[PDB]
Ligand binder design. Structure first.
Ligand code: 507
Ligand code: 507
Lengths: 297, 297
């Protein structure tokens, strides 16, 4: 197997998600995600999607292999992918500021990845429609060309127009609380309608757009990197913390005043507000966001 | 993946277990087991054992690969193994009779496979101790050399003396009811003691020994192939059918009178009775059965 032939060179992250490593396979860099022992169902789902669907796309993390291997005399589940030295968008945004071109390249590349996930393609080229369900800056990697790619399909849900069947999987994991849409926090989400899940991804995308826009220079100024809702919830916020903020108070991230002095940031602000309607049906689609971002400059 | 490159040539079985096919990979025969959609946890467990443990042995079905693939626009889980044209011991016993040498070759090869599963080996050659939990004539394949190999590790349980930890997995499937030991049917089995599981395998092995011995010629005569307990339970017997028979009535398969006129079959009868003690602790071990079968001729 690929696992047996990989040399783990450097651990680049460790947390509740397991571990992510830079390794080498046939002397080339690869990324290796080793899952926590509580998260076999996420490994199973990504393995399923990447093996059963045609998911090659510039803005979706490129898959190499998935294996089981033995380490410390116990089973490890490995996902092996392309390695992106620039790391996560979350960490990257904290280390640099962006000009207008770099900002728009990033957010467009993300909407193009998401739109590709969200659409069903037919023919032998095809793929089912896929919703992500845990989109966030930490699940987006930055490439040397300045575009991003979307990772972590362990919560993905799929839909096929042939059978009109929705495939939700059977994973007890839930999305990152900070980025959960009100209808998830409320538990009023229509779990039988595929559109519901795409709408959850759009909310989260709105939040990511906000995170990126803060780091775009206008009039030589920027905001410091902050996570969504940083001013109203603690670190590692609870369901209840988020529900109070999002459902009861109905808060949204504040737009800095300075965005209204810049035409790109005014457009981006309008875009993010249309991702955050409390009413899931009113939110923009990923395709419409992508067309609008193709038009901003 | 191996799956994408395999040509399914002929389905050799279909049932509650999924499907088993003869296929070709790189122009050689292989077996492909496609799991039922309700049985992902068995696929996961076999994949785990065969990937994480060093399980190569003449009397254990030889593993090639495990994959996920898309067919009829849905996910299939494939186990790919060596192909054994002679098929299952269950079907084979119905199509031929055995002389003394062939009978003993079969039953010894099975006890040697089981003993290898049951023992922990240390060093870099090693493997944990493994109990099977669904041993039966249908889960044993016959090789052209007349020896058998043991298949279907989807219910396997493992133990390591290092950590003294028992790994039971998380599979809702239970063994074949007809072959369940009284302590399983009773629900008095000590689920925390590894020895309990080996003892369940020994009971089942006793039953398989009975099935094989019926087909060995002595004085030019044989019994017809019958499954264990054929005279007391229906096809597809229930837990309750089996419990009444095994726990309350305390029945055991009857030994044909003719076995007591033959010294091999008298030995084999003694061996099987020592596999069937109601008291799990009194039953022989797989290693002791193997040494005794090495001595019978
Ligand atoms: C985000 C996800 O699920 C996933 C899965 C597999 C590989 C990768 C991957 C590819 N190339 C790189 C480079 C650095 C890196 N480090 C951080 C560690 C903590 O935050 C998340 C990523 N990851 N990563 C990411
Ligand atoms: C018994 C198990 O679990 C398993 C798994 C994978 C491959 C094989 C395997 C290998 N070579 C062959 C030849 C014939 C065959 N046919 C029958 C069909 C119905 O009864 C069981 C086996 N199977 N099989 C067996």
């Amino acid at each position: 197997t690929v696992a047996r032939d990989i040399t783990l060179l450097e651990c680049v992250g460790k947390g509740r998600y397991g571990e992510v490593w830079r390794g080498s396979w046939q002397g080339e860099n690869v990324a290796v995600k080793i899952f926590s022992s509580r998260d076999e169902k996420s490994w199973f789902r990504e393995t399923e999607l990447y093996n059963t669907v045609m998911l090659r796309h510039e803005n979706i993390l490129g898959f190499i292999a998935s294996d089981m291997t033995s380490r410390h005399s116990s089973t490890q589940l490995w996902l092996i992918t392309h390695y992106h030295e620039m790391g996560s968008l979350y960490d990257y945004l904290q280390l640099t500021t962006l000009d207008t071109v770099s900002c728009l390249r990033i957010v467009l590349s993300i909407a193009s990845g998401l739109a590709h996930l969200h659409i069903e393609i037919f023919g032998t080229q095809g793929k089912p429609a896929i919703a992500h369900r845990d989109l966030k800056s930490k699940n987006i990697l930055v490439k040397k060309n300045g575009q991003c790619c979307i990772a972590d399909l362990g919560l993905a849900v799929m839909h096929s127009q042939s059978t009109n069947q929705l495939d939700v999987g059977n994973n007890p994991r839930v999305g990152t609380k900070r980025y959960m849409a009100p209808e998830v926090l409320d538990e009023t989400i229509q779990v039988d309608c595929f559109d519901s899940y795409k709408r959850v991804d759009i909310w989260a995308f709105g939040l990511v757009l906000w995170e990126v826009a803060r780091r775009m220079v206008s009039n030589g100024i920027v905001e410091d990197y902050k996570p969504p809702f940083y001013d109203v919830v603690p670190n590692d916020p609870s369901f209840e913390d988020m529900r109070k903020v999002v459902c009861v108070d109905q808060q949204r991230p504040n737009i800095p005043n300075r965005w209204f002095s810049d035409p790109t940031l005014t457009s981006l602000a309008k875009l993010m507000k249309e991702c955050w309607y409390q009413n899931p049906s009113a939110r923009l689609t990923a395709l419409r966001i992508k067309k609008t971002l193709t038009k901003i400059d």
